[PDB]
Amino acid sequence: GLMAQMATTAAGVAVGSAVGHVMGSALTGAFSGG
Amino acid sequence: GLMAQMATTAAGVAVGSAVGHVMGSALTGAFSGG
Amino acid sequence: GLMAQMATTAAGVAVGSAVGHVMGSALTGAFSGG
Amino acid sequence: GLMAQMATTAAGVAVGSAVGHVMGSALTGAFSGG
Amino acid sequence: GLMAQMATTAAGVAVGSAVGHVMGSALTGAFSGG
Amino acid sequence: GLMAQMATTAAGVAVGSAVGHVMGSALTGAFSGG
Amino acid sequence: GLMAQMATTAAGVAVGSAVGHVMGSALTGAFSGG
Amino acid sequence: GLMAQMATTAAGVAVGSAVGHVMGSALTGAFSGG
Amino acid sequence: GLMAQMATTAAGVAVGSAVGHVMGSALTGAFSGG
Amino acid sequence: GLMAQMATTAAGVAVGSAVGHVMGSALTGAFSGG
Amino acid sequence: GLMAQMATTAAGVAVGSAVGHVMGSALTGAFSGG
Amino acid sequence: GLMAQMATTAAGVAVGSAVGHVMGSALTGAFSGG
Amino acid sequence: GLMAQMATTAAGVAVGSAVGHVMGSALTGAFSGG
Amino acid sequence: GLMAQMATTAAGVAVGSAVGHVMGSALTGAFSGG
Amino acid sequence: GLMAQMATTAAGVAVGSAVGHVMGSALTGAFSGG
Amino acid sequence: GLMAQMATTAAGVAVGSAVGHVMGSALTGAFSGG
Amino acid sequence: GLMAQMATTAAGVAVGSAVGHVMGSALTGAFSGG
Amino acid sequence: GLMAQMATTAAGVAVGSAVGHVMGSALTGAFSGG
């Protein structure tokens, strides 16, 4: 049962590149601004 | 049972590129601005 | 039972490119602005 | 039982390109603005 | 039982291109603006 | 039992192109603006 | 039992092109504006 | 038992082109404006 | 038992072209404006 | 000298709705398929 | 010198609705298929 | 000399909705497929 | 000399919604597929 | 001489929504696929 | 001479939303795939 | 001579949201894949 | 002569959000993949 | 002659958020993969 994640980025000029990977995780977040 | 995720990005000039991958995850989020 | 996801993006000039992948996940989100 | 998702984008000038992939997922969202 | 989804986009100048793919998913959403 | 979905878009100048694919999914949505 | 869906769009200048595909899905929606 | 759907659109200048495909689906919608 | 649907549209200048395809579906809709 | 254009569309289930508006414009298009 | 254009469409189930508006415009189109 | 364009769309379930607006513009497009 | 463009879209479930606005612009596009 | 462009989109579940705005611009694009 | 552009998007579940704004710009793009 | 651009996006669950703004710019891009 | 650009994004769960702003710039990009 | 750029992002759970700002710049980029 192979599980994989890939992400290739290649730019001449990159301003603000971002990559995020999540696998088999349990993320909990809350925002209460104000 | 192979499971895969791929994402290739290639730009001459990229301003604000973003990539997000989620696999087998349980994400919970809340927003309460104000 | 192979499961796959792919996304290829290639631009001369990209302003605000975005890619999102979700597989076998349970995402819960709430918005309460105001 | 192969399941696949693909998306290829190629632009000379792209302003605001977006790609979203969902497979075997259970997304729940709510909006309550105001 | 092969199941597939594809989407190819190619523009000289694209302003606001978008692609969305859903397969074997259960999305629930609500809007309550006001 | 092959099931497939395809969508090819090619424009010299595209302003607001959109593509949406749904296969074997159960989407529930509600709108309550006002 | 092959089931397929295709959509090809090609324009010199496209302003507001849209494509939607649904196959083997159960979409439920409600509108209650006002 | 092959089932297929196709739609080809090709315009010099298209303002507001739209394509919708439904196959083997059960769509339920309601409108209650006012 | 082949079942097929096709629609080809080709215009020099198209303002508001639309195509809709339904096959083996059960669509239910209601309008209650006012 | 007020000039106005309006278009209201409201459907319980719409498959392939399209709207196009042109005002004070000079659109030139050509088709040469084949 | 008020000039106006209106179009209201309201259907329980609409498959392929289209609306096009032109005002004070000069559209030129050509078709040469074959 | 007020000039305006409006378009309101409201559907319980919309598959492939599109809106295009052009005002005071000079669009030139060509198609040469084949 | 006020010039305005508006477009409101509100759907319970929208698959492939698109909006395009052009005002005081000169768009030139060409398609040469094949 | 006020010039404005607006676009409001609000969906319970949106798959592939797109918005494009152009004002006082000169976009030139070419497609030469093949 | 006020010139403005706005775009508001609000969805319970959005998969592939995109927004693009251009004002007073001169974008040139070319596609030569193949 | 005020010139402005705005874009507000608010989703319960957004997968692949993108925003691009261009004002008073001269973007040149080329694609030569293959 | 005030010139401004704004972009607000607020999501309960965002996977791959992207924002790009360009003002008074001259971006040149080229893609030559292959 | 005030010139400004803003971008606010607020998410309960963000996977791959990106922001890019360019003002009064001359970016040149080239891609030659292969």
Author numbering:
A (entry chain R), B (entry chain P), C (entry chain N), D (entry chain F), E (entry chain D), F (entry chain B), ...: 43 to 76
How is this structure described in the published paper?
Mitochondrial proteins CHCHD10 and CHCHD2 are mutated in rare cases of heritable FTD, ALS and PD and aggregate in tissues affected by these diseases. Here, we demonstrate that the low complexity N-terminal domains of both D10 and D2, as well as the full-length proteins, can form amyloid fibrils in vitro and in vivo. Structures of D10 and D2 fibrils assembled in vitro from the low complexity N-terminal domains of each protein show that their core comprises the most highly conserved region between the two proteins. For D10 and D2, the central conserved VAV motif forms a beta-strand that is associated with the protofilament interface in all the structures we have observed, suggesting that it may be a critical element in fibril formation and may be expected to appear in ex vivo structures as well.
Using cryo-EM, we observed several distinct D10-NT fibril polymorphs (see Methods section on Cryo-EM sample preparation and data collection) and determined three different structures. Polymorph-2, solved to 2.70 Å resolution, also contains two identical symmetry-related PFs, with a fold (PF2) distinct from that found in polymorph-1 (PF1). PF2 is comprised of residues G43–G76 and exhibits four strands consisting of residues M45–A53 (similar to strand-1 in PF1), V55–V57 (similar to strand-2 in PF1), A60–V64 and L69–F73. An extensive inter-PF2 interface is comprised of strands 2–4. However, in the PF2 and PF3 D10-NT folds, some of the sequence variation sites are positioned within the PF fold, suggesting that these D10-NT folds may not be compatible with the D2 sequence. For WT D10-NT, we obtained 2D classes closely resembling those observed for WT D10-NT polymorph-2. We have provided evidence in the form of 2D classes obtained from cryo-EM datasets of independent samples that the WT D10-NT polymorph-2, the S59L D10-NT and the WT D2-NT structures we determined are reproducible and may therefore be preferred by their respective variants. The resulting structure was nearly identical to the WT D10-NT polymorph-2 structure, indicating that this mutation likely does not alter D10 fibril structure.
